[PDB]
Design an enzyme around this catalytic site. Sequence first.
Site, PDB file in Angstrom:
ATOM      1  N   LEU A  22      -6.327   6.990   2.738  1.00  0.00           N
ATOM      2  CA  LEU A  22      -7.420   6.259   3.583  1.00  0.00           C
ATOM      3  C   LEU A  22      -8.621   7.152   3.784  1.00  0.00           C
ATOM      4  O   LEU A  22      -8.379   8.373   3.192  1.00  0.00           O
ATOM      5  CB  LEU A  22      -7.369   6.471   5.675  1.00  0.00           C
ATOM      6  CG  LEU A  22      -6.373   6.031   6.328  1.00  0.00           C
ATOM      7  CD1 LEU A  22      -6.648   5.966   7.861  1.00  0.00           C
ATOM      8  CD2 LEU A  22      -5.747   4.616   5.778  1.00  0.00           C
ATOM      9  N   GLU A  30      -8.315   5.162  16.370  1.00  0.00           N
ATOM     10  CA  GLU A  30      -7.718   3.822  15.428  1.00  0.00           C
ATOM     11  C   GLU A  30      -6.314   3.345  15.081  1.00  0.00           C
ATOM     12  O   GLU A  30      -5.871   2.593  15.088  1.00  0.00           O
ATOM     13  CB  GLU A  30      -9.024   3.914  14.294  1.00  0.00           C
ATOM     14  CG  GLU A  30      -8.646   2.557  13.314  1.00  0.00           C
ATOM     15  CD  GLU A  30      -8.259   2.033  12.527  1.00  0.00           C
ATOM     16  OE1 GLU A  30      -8.336   0.600  12.966  1.00  0.00           O
ATOM     17  OE2 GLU A  30      -7.410   1.797  12.299  1.00  0.00           O
TER      18      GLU A  30
HETATM   19  N1  LIG Z   1      -7.086   0.775   6.008  1.00  0.00           N
HETATM   20  C1  LIG Z   1      -6.186  -0.331   6.076  1.00  0.00           C
HETATM   21  O1  LIG Z   1      -5.588  -1.338   6.838  1.00  0.00           O
HETATM   22  C2  LIG Z   1      -5.185   0.186   5.120  1.00  0.00           C
HETATM   23  C3  LIG Z   1      -3.640  -0.402   4.931  1.00  0.00           C
HETATM   24  C4  LIG Z   1      -2.687  -0.086   4.197  1.00  0.00           C
HETATM   25  C5  LIG Z   1      -2.813   0.902   3.593  1.00  0.00           C
HETATM   26  N2  LIG Z   1      -3.375   1.549   3.389  1.00  0.00           N
HETATM   27  C6  LIG Z   1      -4.140   1.945   1.623  1.00  0.00           C
HETATM   28  O2  LIG Z   1      -4.081   1.433   0.652  1.00  0.00           O
HETATM   29  C7  LIG Z   1      -3.352   1.598  -0.239  1.00  0.00           C
HETATM   30  C8  LIG Z   1      -1.895   0.843  -0.463  1.00  0.00           C
HETATM   31  O3  LIG Z   1      -2.134  -0.167  -0.513  1.00  0.00           O
HETATM   32  P1  LIG Z   1      -2.324  -0.555  -2.038  1.00  0.00           P
HETATM   33  O4  LIG Z   1      -3.370  -2.555  -2.343  1.00  0.00           O
HETATM   34  O5  LIG Z   1      -3.084   0.438  -2.769  1.00  0.00           O
HETATM   35  O6  LIG Z   1      -1.226  -0.963  -2.439  1.00  0.00           O
HETATM   36  P2  LIG Z   1      -0.077  -2.287  -1.509  1.00  0.00           P
HETATM   37  O7  LIG Z   1      -0.245  -3.306  -1.845  1.00  0.00           O
HETATM   38  O8  LIG Z   1       0.488  -1.276  -0.225  1.00  0.00           O
HETATM   39  O9  LIG Z   1       1.673  -1.606  -2.881  1.00  0.00           O
HETATM   40  C9  LIG Z   1       1.423  -2.714  -4.296  1.00  0.00           C
HETATM   41  C10 LIG Z   1       2.655  -2.708  -4.226  1.00  0.00           C
HETATM   42  O10 LIG Z   1       3.476  -3.714  -3.176  1.00  0.00           O
HETATM   43  C11 LIG Z   1       3.973  -5.030  -3.910  1.00  0.00           C
HETATM   44  N3  LIG Z   1       2.707  -5.760  -3.660  1.00  0.00           N
HETATM   45  C12 LIG Z   1       1.767  -6.033  -2.940  1.00  0.00           C
HETATM   46  N4  LIG Z   1       2.105  -7.396  -2.066  1.00  0.00           N
HETATM   47  C13 LIG Z   1       3.011  -8.272  -3.220  1.00  0.00           C
HETATM   48  C14 LIG Z   1       3.073  -9.348  -2.444  1.00  0.00           C
HETATM   49  N5  LIG Z   1       2.184 -10.122  -1.541  1.00  0.00           N
HETATM   50  N6  LIG Z   1       4.626 -10.205  -3.329  1.00  0.00           N
HETATM   51  C15 LIG Z   1       4.912  -8.908  -3.850  1.00  0.00           C
HETATM   52  N7  LIG Z   1       5.097  -7.879  -4.170  1.00  0.00           N
HETATM   53  C16 LIG Z   1       3.656  -7.667  -3.614  1.00  0.00           C
HETATM   54  C17 LIG Z   1       3.229  -4.527  -5.756  1.00  0.00           C
HETATM   55  O11 LIG Z   1       5.034  -3.440  -5.993  1.00  0.00           O
HETATM   56  P3  LIG Z   1       6.064  -3.741  -6.938  1.00  0.00           P
HETATM   57  O12 LIG Z   1       4.778  -3.869  -8.227  1.00  0.00           O
HETATM   58  O13 LIG Z   1       7.131  -2.884  -7.203  1.00  0.00           O
HETATM   59  O14 LIG Z   1       6.088  -5.008  -7.309  1.00  0.00           O
HETATM   60  C18 LIG Z   1       2.441  -3.937  -5.610  1.00  0.00           C
HETATM   61  O15 LIG Z   1       2.542  -3.502  -7.149  1.00  0.00           O
HETATM   62  C19 LIG Z   1      -2.972   3.049  -0.033  1.00  0.00           C
HETATM   63  O16 LIG Z   1      -4.469   3.814  -0.556  1.00  0.00           O
HETATM   64  C20 LIG Z   1      -3.303   3.316   0.915  1.00  0.00           C
HETATM   65  O17 LIG Z   1      -3.323   4.273   2.349  1.00  0.00           O
HETATM   66  C21 LIG Z   1      -4.720   0.808   4.158  1.00  0.00           C
HETATM   67  C1  LIG Z   2      -4.563   3.617  10.683  1.00  0.00           C
HETATM   68  C2  LIG Z   2      -4.668   2.938   9.756  1.00  0.00           C
HETATM   69  C3  LIG Z   2      -5.195   1.155   9.690  1.00  0.00           C
HETATM   70  N1  LIG Z   2      -5.849   0.601  10.592  1.00  0.00           N
HETATM   71  C4  LIG Z   2      -5.842  -0.608  10.907  1.00  0.00           C
HETATM   72  N2  LIG Z   2      -6.834  -1.384  12.052  1.00  0.00           N
HETATM   73  N3  LIG Z   2      -4.418  -1.152   9.921  1.00  0.00           N
HETATM   74  C5  LIG Z   2      -3.809  -0.939   9.109  1.00  0.00           C
HETATM   75  N4  LIG Z   2      -2.787  -1.365   8.651  1.00  0.00           N
HETATM   76  C6  LIG Z   2      -4.108   0.691   9.526  1.00  0.00           C
HETATM   77  O1  LIG Z   2      -2.949   1.049   7.800  1.00  0.00           O
HETATM   78  C7  LIG Z   2      -1.649   1.652   9.052  1.00  0.00           C
HETATM   79  C8  LIG Z   2      -1.244   2.115   7.327  1.00  0.00           C
HETATM   80  C9  LIG Z   2      -0.074   3.095   7.886  1.00  0.00           C
HETATM   81  O2  LIG Z   2      -0.212   4.048   8.106  1.00  0.00           O
HETATM   82  C10 LIG Z   2       0.697   5.516   9.184  1.00  0.00           C
HETATM   83  C11 LIG Z   2       1.674   5.348   9.915  1.00  0.00           C
HETATM   84  C12 LIG Z   2       2.100   5.815  10.784  1.00  0.00           C
HETATM   85  C13 LIG Z   2       1.886   7.009   9.804  1.00  0.00           C
HETATM   86  C14 LIG Z   2       0.967   7.146   8.948  1.00  0.00           C
HETATM   87  C15 LIG Z   2       0.706   6.698   8.275  1.00  0.00           C
HETATM   88  C16 LIG Z   2      -0.655   6.619   7.347  1.00  0.00           C
HETATM   89  C17 LIG Z   2      -1.966   6.933   7.604  1.00  0.00           C
HETATM   90  C18 LIG Z   2      -3.174   7.615   6.506  1.00  0.00           C
HETATM   91  F1  LIG Z   2      -1.901   7.155   4.979  1.00  0.00           F
HETATM   92  C19 LIG Z   2      -2.419   5.931   7.682  1.00  0.00           C
HETATM   93  O3  LIG Z   2      -2.241   5.237   7.595  1.00  0.00           O
HETATM   94  O4  LIG Z   2      -2.908   6.411   8.919  1.00  0.00           O
END
Ligand SMILES: NC(=O)c1ccc[n+]([C@@H]2O[C@H](COP(=O)([O-])OP(=O)(O)OC[C@H]3O[C@@H](n4cnc5c(N)ncnc54)[C@H](OP(=O)(O)O)[C@@H]3O)[C@@H](O)[C@H]2O)c1
Ligand SMILES: CCc1nc(N)nc(N)c1OCCCOc1ccccc1C[C@@H](CF)C(=O)O
EC number: 1.5.1.3
Length: 186
Positions: A22, A30
């Site tokens: 994150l 959150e």
């Molecule tokens: N703040 C939030 O709510 C939140 C939520 C989720 C994650 N995160 C953060 O975001 C990052 C991860 O997300 P990201 O965008 O980098 O990657 P991602 O979407 O989780 O992973 C990307 C990979 O997933 C597959 N993929 C994604 N979308 C696809 C689709 N529509 N159809 C088919 N395959 C698909 C592909 O793999 P292949 O190349 O193998 O096909 C692509 O290379 C991390 O930093 C994580 O901590 C934050």
């Molecule tokens: C809370 C963030 C968030 N918030 C909203 N509202 N929507 C989302 N999709 C979202 O991402 C969830 C992604 C799943 O991540 C985890 C679920 C369980 C244990 C640990 C993690 C990973 C840590 C840091 F990488 C985290 O992400 O808390």
Amino acid sequence: VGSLNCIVAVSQNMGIGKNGDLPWPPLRNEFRYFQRMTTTSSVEGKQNLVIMGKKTWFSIPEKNRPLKGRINLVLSRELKEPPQGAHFLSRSLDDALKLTEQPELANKVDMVWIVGGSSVYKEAMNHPGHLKLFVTRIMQDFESDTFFPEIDLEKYKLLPEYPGVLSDVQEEKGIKYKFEVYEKND
Ligand SMILES: NC(=O)c1ccc[n+]([C@@H]2O[C@H](COP(=O)([O-])OP(=O)(O)OC[C@H]3O[C@@H](n4cnc5c(N)ncnc54)[C@H](OP(=O)(O)O)[C@@H]3O)[C@@H](O)[C@H]2O)c1
Ligand SMILES: CCc1nc(N)nc(N)c1OCCCOc1ccccc1C[C@@H](CF)C(=O)O
């Protein structure tokens, strides 16, 4: 199989991730919100399904994979089998949603939650039909390398309140944020 939902937390500069983590320091409530919204099933005997990209899967600590109390599905075109701890893997969101009609899932799944990352949100937000976006607006900029696609306000309505969701400003660790819910039905 119930509703189709996206859930995301996003900074003011639209960031959702940074170096596989994150962009902001951990926000306990959150996280609790994310867990409760995606785990709570309205239907006895069913679990919700969480759909995530490959990088989001591996960003969860190993001790917490698969996400407990939910059926986990990973999207990837490169993986030949679900990663260790997972039991479902699809090549696209479209395939994953069609998979929920098959017997192995149709009677087990209540709600479907897309939990990231960027290209998963993008495929879902363009998906026709009834969609809700549960968006946490983190009210600060954070350095990010992965972003949330902009919401098409010609298609989505912003709801003023949503049942069970507080509508006022939250604050932890010096960081203010707000829970928003968008809806469309095209
Ligand atoms: N703040 C939030 O709510 C939140 C939520 C989720 C994650 N995160 C953060 O975001 C990052 C991860 O997300 P990201 O965008 O980098 O990657 P991602 O979407 O989780 O992973 C990307 C990979 O997933 C597959 N993929 C994604 N979308 C696809 C689709 N529509 N159809 C088919 N395959 C698909 C592909 O793999 P292949 O190349 O193998 O096909 C692509 O290379 C991390 O930093 C994580 O901590 C934050
Ligand atoms: C809370 C963030 C968030 N918030 C909203 N509202 N929507 C989302 N999709 C979202 O991402 C969830 C992604 C799943 O991540 C985890 C679920 C369980 C244990 C640990 C993690 C990973 C840590 C840091 F990488 C985290 O992400 O808390």
